[PDB]
Amino acid sequence: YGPDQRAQKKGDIILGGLFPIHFGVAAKDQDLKSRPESVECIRYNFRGFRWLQAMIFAIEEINSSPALLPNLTLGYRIFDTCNTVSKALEATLSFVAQNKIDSLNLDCSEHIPSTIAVVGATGSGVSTAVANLLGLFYIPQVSYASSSRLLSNKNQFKSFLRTIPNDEHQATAMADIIEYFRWNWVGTIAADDDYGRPGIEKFREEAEERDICIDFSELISQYSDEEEIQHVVEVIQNSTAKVIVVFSSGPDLEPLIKEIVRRNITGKIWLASEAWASSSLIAMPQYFHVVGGTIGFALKAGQIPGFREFLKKVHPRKSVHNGFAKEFWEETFNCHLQEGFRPLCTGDENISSVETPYIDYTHLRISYNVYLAVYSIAHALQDIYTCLPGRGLFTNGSCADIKKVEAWQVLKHLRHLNFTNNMGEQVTFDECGDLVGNYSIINWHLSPEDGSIVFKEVGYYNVYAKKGERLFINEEKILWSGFSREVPFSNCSRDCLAGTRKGIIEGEPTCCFECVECPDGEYSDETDASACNKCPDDFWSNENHTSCIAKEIEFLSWTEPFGIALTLFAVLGIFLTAFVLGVFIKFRNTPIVKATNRELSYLLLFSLLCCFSSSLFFIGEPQDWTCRLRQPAFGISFVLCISCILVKTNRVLLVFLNLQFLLVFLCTFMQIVICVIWLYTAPPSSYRNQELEDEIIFITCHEGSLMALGFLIGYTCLLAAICFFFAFKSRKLPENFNEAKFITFSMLIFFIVWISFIPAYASTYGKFVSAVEVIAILAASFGLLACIFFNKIYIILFKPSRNTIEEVRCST
Amino acid sequence: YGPDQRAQKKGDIILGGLFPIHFGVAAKDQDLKSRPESVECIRYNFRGFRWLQAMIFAIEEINSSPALLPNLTLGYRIFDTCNTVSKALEATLSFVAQNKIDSLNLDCSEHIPSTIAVVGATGSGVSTAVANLLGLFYIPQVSYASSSRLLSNKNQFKSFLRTIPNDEHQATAMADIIEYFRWNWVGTIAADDDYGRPGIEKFREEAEERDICIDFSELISQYSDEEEIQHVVEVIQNSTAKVIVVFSSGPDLEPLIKEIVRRNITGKIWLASEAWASSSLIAMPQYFHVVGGTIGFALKAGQIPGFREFLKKVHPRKSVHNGFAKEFWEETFNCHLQFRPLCTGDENISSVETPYIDYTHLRISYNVYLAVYSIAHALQDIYTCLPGRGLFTNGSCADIKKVEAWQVLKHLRHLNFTNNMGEQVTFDECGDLVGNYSIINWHLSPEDGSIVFKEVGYYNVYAKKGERLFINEEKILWSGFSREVPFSNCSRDCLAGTRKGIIEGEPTCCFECVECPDGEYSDETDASACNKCPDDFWSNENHTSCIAKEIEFLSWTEPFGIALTLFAVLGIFLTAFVLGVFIKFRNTPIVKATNRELSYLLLFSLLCCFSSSLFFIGEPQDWTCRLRQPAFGISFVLCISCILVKTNRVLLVFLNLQFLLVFLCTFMQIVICVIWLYTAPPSSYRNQELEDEIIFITCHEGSLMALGFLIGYTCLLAAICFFFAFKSRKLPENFNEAKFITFSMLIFFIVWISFIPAYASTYGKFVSAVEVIAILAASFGLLACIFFNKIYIILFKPSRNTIEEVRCST
């Protein structure tokens, strides 16, 4: 009536199931020279047998309780799929044998039992192929471990339900894990089925959202040959990425793991999915120098309060409704049962003496899914049983009949299901028939007692919280590759420090770059800069281009000690001129003072008080008003002083008011008219220039027109030359204590100071070019004050005042 | 047993058939006392009807010929799938009904026929679901239009064969088309099934190798609701990529196309796969402002001779074995068979424009023809087997009257036949067939206003990589117009003055051009690193290419240097005239009155003084700048020391002593010029620090103390002579010589004082222009004062009486 090896028991209501008792089929090649024969399944799976026992224990538990489904019993027909689509299709063609006869009008035993619900398959290709056929007859299929997203399409899979979350949240969780430890450079490996490809595509979308670069991406399989495995290992070994993300199962990853262990490749960081993070085919001590320190996902554990004793009650003779117990007994103890080199089995053997994954578990993660997968169908049937007329889920509020139940009525009550389990948590299904739950994050260690691999919990993924606040990882429990508390470095290129930029594009992806220094006018202080940023105006870049600092303004100042030293030599001149004026005003109507002109000497001593005070326009910060008055002050004061010297000597002044006060006004007026035309045609101005150096701003003054500056100096030098020539011709003539000799000396000192000044102006730098124009004024101003006046002051004031000051003297 | 309407004919060997007579099914989802019923198909498909008629015509043509399978007949049973997996599984269960009883031991009618082979489905999900159920019983399945790569796995699909190539070459061809027209910013759209998804993953894998950046990737479906369509359209119209690559079919693309038409989105470039490049659902003229100008692939054509005449003979009452003809006659003429009027039987098939009779090429109908003939040649190879040469265990043949499905599968695995067009047909180890592609482009007809597909190229799968694609650019209208090739790059290419230089958290295809700073350049049209311009060169103005620098010095061939050279040669040629008059007119009282031998040592020092100015003209070198200053120093101290001991007033009374006072005064400067050059020598120096455009060649003088000593000693010896000669200006002796000595020593100081501003006021190339005139003025002033008045008296008219020993004494 189907497959030979089966577990079945009769009752009023039949359920079906499909479990992996073997890992696969025998690898043989069909040459088709003869009739094809049925294939054999090779490797025994003990986890699958425990999952099968979960169904039987749940069904018997419901059969023993009068709270759930009174006066009604359950049966089962359970087969083996061997992780192959063909054997699953052979079993599910037996599930639909009665339903298909009525649809094909084939009209032969007529005693075929009916299946109203199936606890579905493990893999996601097997489940799709089963659901394709079960959807024709609306038979519900409650899978416990199929987690592909493609089964959430309710246009194609009308009657599919599951008790496991799908793989969108796990891909997003791996993206959060990679983003958490600050990595960019990864690689991906997938199985070539319906479980690997959507997980890798969702992870690729999530990683491309968060700027994570993928180096290599490969597909592997259980039946891939040797050349493909060698090519994948060459792809892995040619890469600098340490972090590798795997969506695969155990049987699909075991060839690649064995090949990587054979070449002994150490130092990779494996990120595991739910299928192989707890797999005993890969969690072996022999491989721990390759796969140590693996970080992986797990489901949430469950409590079945009587299950281990039921596992221990197994026996190959007392299990008459289980056809799978005999081979479990043979593979567990390595012997042979006599059919009613391997020795003969006896019934007196102990389950606890052999370490197999049948009772070596510490948690229940998929067996709890099988437990709820039976209890959901049981509460759907109970919801059918307890209905009151007029309040059903049908047209007129009518109710289905518990004596005559059809599969689509159970499907309709499974679409509206809300029941509380043994822990007090509520179980419902979505509009896509899904169920949601948390994840655990575990890490592979090495036991110090027996050397096996221990899965220690390091964190959780809480699916109910807001986006960005879901992952929790404790870093103090992670051992990277079984040791090495340092977090490993797994991004492409090392970061550029301050004063550099990411700079050069290469043709590689964005994660790989270089480091280039900034120019000499800009600043950059950040890790991984893409450009260099310009300083604001009147700022210049700091050394190493980390920050930007201010700029220094250079001018002659009032408070620096050189300016303080130059102010006192211009104050001393004023208080020496105001002493000569004091002696001249107090000691008037005396022969020396009255012998020459008294009124011209007052106008000469006022012009000297203007010549000393005209040097203070060259000290300080230049502005507009102190550069439009800087040159006319010197010009007018010196032409007034030189005119008063020239017109006073009286030898060729009156013999060739007064006629001598009118030769001063014209000579100063011809300079005033120049200084008015200059300021009303082309005025001087200030300037803040930055062109000599990039770190010093100089404050200088533009003089405007140079012709009006040439006239200003040429007229003064012309008048001093006329005075020098007219005073040189009277040096021997003694009159007023040999005055023309001292006038000649003063006009010589004026030209000596000018000729000494004209080298020094064109050879100095800023803040020192306004330092020569003060000493050039404060040398001529004492040279025109000493020679004319100090000899007469000595005769008037000191001891020659007894006899030398008289009208008899100062005549020869 | 099975579906209601079918096309069925009895024979000795029965073949199956699965064709899409309809496009899809309706939507009904509720379970309120349903006992849910059969789903209805909606839209009629005439192209699928033509494919079904191709299979029927091939079977009838095989049965008419005595040269292929004699004394035997072929039958058929053909169903409809409506592009649905469930509707195909209902028929496939009817196909395997006899074999299924034996496996389950279900045991009854016994009249169930046995199907030998199935002509497979169109879609790549429907074919997978059929192949899963058909591989149990080893019934072969030959598909005419499924092209997914997932069907090439022979561990899972043990009995599946194809007559259409898979989609590796199509995705590689799309990558070659994109690389040919030089784009790097595209987008992708794929159908959400077993057709679109591996093809778009293969295209992504090929496009990462060729440096093509993808902007967006989205998935569509036939039964998508409204919100997904609005989201996909909003993804499309935020992108700057004009090139969109679609890998889907007609019914899955139609809702998105309708939504893009209603929002009037224009300007995009569509790249079509084989499925919708000839689809009439998308190629409506009302959509031409959106999808006009599409570039797509197409298969290779075929020839079936009497096929149109077979198509023109369909009739609802003369087709007794084809139960699909009644709905065809209703849908073609919009009438009703016994508000739609009542049909008569006499309507004309050529009066209605449908895709049934208007095709102009056969592509998939030839695939159905080749499928049926492949099965027939496998049966003929079974039939003509010689005993002892079989393909079975002991070399034994099969039996044609008791044939089974696995025997036909074994023979189809070893099939090699020739078709009506003269080629060879065989399947490889994955049951795959290899073929070329044609590349077509959508135009608008100027007569009917419809859409015309014009061949612009071919893709050749038998050539070496990089030599497969052929495209004729002269035949492409890029949107129904616009012969210019469009632009799809993320950023425009940089120029030679700039560099490709930013990173934004954006893909490598997107950048911006940063201009090179003053001093750098590039010289390529896409440069990832701006280059520093080489040494002694500088950027021009736009940093697109840089030019050399200008070296600044006073030169021999510039006219100013020529003028200085002439003014220095005139002094030598005037000194050699005074020396000629002094040598010819010797033992005469003017020449003999002073020291004659000491006046020959002064006209040599003047010849050295004029020639010492030629070290300041030209390019500075190491030897010129090491002899530039000592030559001036020794020549001027010799020329001043020969004047100092010549006046004779305080020289011999305060060739015995004059030469021994010349020698010490020149030796005291020779020792300085030896210590300076053997302790701290001067050197040449090229400097670029003043300006970035001009290099200056100047000279470092080394120590400044040994430079100050020369000038100080020279001015000291010129001041002592001035003081000693000023005190004798009135004394008349040898024609008032001390007055002229005073004038010469005054002119020397005037030239020095005039020189000292101009050295510190000039720039480069003019600072060596003042040091020549300052030497050529002192050298003329130390000659004109001394050696002209005497020459005038000796040579010209005062030679009669003034030159005598009675004169030149007072």
Ligand SMILES: CC(C)(Cc1ccc2ccccc2c1)NC[C@@H](O)COc1cccc(Cl)c1C#N
């Ligand atoms: C104040 C002053 C007029 C300089 C000055 C000072 C004191 C002096 C004492 C006696 C006599 C002339 C004197 C000139 N400001 C002008 C300055 O900007 C620029 O000056 C020059 C710059 C170049 C060449 C010459 Cl030829 C001069 C002068 N001259």
Ligand SMILES: CC(C)(Cc1ccc2ccccc2c1)NC[C@@H](O)COc1cccc(Cl)c1C#N
């Ligand atoms: C050739 C020379 C010695 C300049 C020279 C030329 C002709 C001259 C004629 C008469 C007398 C002295 C003369 C000096 N090269 C020196 C030059 O580099 C630098 O010179 C100076 C630079 C700054 C200050 C002074 Cl004080 C001098 C001089 N001096």
Ligand SMILES: *[C@@H]1O[C@H](CO)[C@@H](O[C@@H]2O[C@H](CO)[C@@H](O)[C@H](O)[C@H]2NC(C)=O)[C@H](O)[C@H]1NC(C)=O
């Ligand atoms: C768009 O970008 C592509 C590549 O990103 C540019 O194609 C390059 O053009 C230069 C100039 O002849 C060639 O040297 C390169 O070999 C081309 N690249 C490739 C990959 O072939 C194309 O020119 C750009 N189009 C623009 C800027 O209009």
Ligand SMILES: N[C@@H](Cc1c[nH]c2ccccc12)C(=O)O
């Ligand atoms: N859900 C996985 C299968 C799976 C989950 N947990 C497992 C444990 C063991 C083996 C397989 C599994 C899939 O879709 O393919």
Ligand SMILES: N[C@@H](Cc1c[nH]c2ccccc12)C(=O)O
């Ligand atoms: N190649 C398509 C099938 C196909 C080819 N041409 C078509 C024309 C119309 C519809 C479907 C098709 C597939 O694999 O799915």
Ligand SMILES: *[C@@H]1O[C@H](CO)[C@@H](O)[C@H](O)[C@H]1NC(C)=O
């Ligand atoms: C790359 O690695 C560095 C450590 O070298 C780390 O600080 C950084 O966050 C990583 N990720 C980036 C740049 O995205």
Ligand SMILES: *[C@@H]1O[C@H](CO)[C@@H](O)[C@H](O)[C@H]1NC(C)=O
């Ligand atoms: C890996 O690198 C080696 C270099 O020795 C090369 O030969 C090989 O083809 C590479 N494999 C890849 C890129 O898959």
Ligand SMILES: *[C@@H]1O[C@H](CO)[C@@H](O)[C@H](O)[C@H]1NC(C)=O
């Ligand atoms: C393999 O790699 C491990 C890692 O350190 C090393 O200890 C060992 O020596 C290597 N070789 C073998 C043969 O195990």
Ligand SMILES: *[C@@H]1O[C@H](CO)[C@@H](O)[C@H](O)[C@H]1NC(C)=O
């Ligand atoms: C299930 O029932 C509980 C209690 O009646 C209710 O609080 C909860 O919202 C229900 N769940 C759903 C999905 O309706």
Ligand SMILES: *[C@@H]1O[C@H](CO)[C@@H](O)[C@H](O)[C@H]1NC(C)=O
């Ligand atoms: C998931 O985890 C969070 C916090 O760890 C917890 O509050 C929540 O109850 C968990 N979910 C379930 C269904 O227990």
Ligand SMILES: *[C@@H]1O[C@H](CO)[C@@H](O)[C@H](O)[C@H]1NC(C)=O
């Ligand atoms: C597209 O543009 C709209 C309008 O600005 C914007 O709201 C949306 O976020 C953009 N992106 C996508 C993916 O739709």
Ligand SMILES: *[C@@H]1O[C@H](CO)[C@@H](O)[C@H](O)[C@H]1NC(C)=O
């Ligand atoms: C669509 O837009 C184009 C220009 O963008 C315009 O010519 C055309 O008429 C539009 N079609 C409509 C509004 O139907």
Ligand SMILES: *[C@@H]1O[C@H](CO)[C@@H](O)[C@H](O)[C@H]1NC(C)=O
């Ligand atoms: C198929 O038949 C042709 C015709 O003789 C022959 O040339 C060819 O070698 C055969 N085999 C293959 C694999 O094409």
Ligand SMILES: *[C@@H]1O[C@H](CO)[C@@H](O)[C@H](O)[C@H]1NC(C)=O
């Ligand atoms: C395929 O394309 C090439 C290029 O034109 C051509 O030579 C060849 O004949 C075509 N057909 C076949 C069957 O190879």
Ligand SMILES: [Ca+2]
């Ligand atoms: Ca009970």
Ligand SMILES: [Ca+2]
């Ligand atoms: Ca690359």
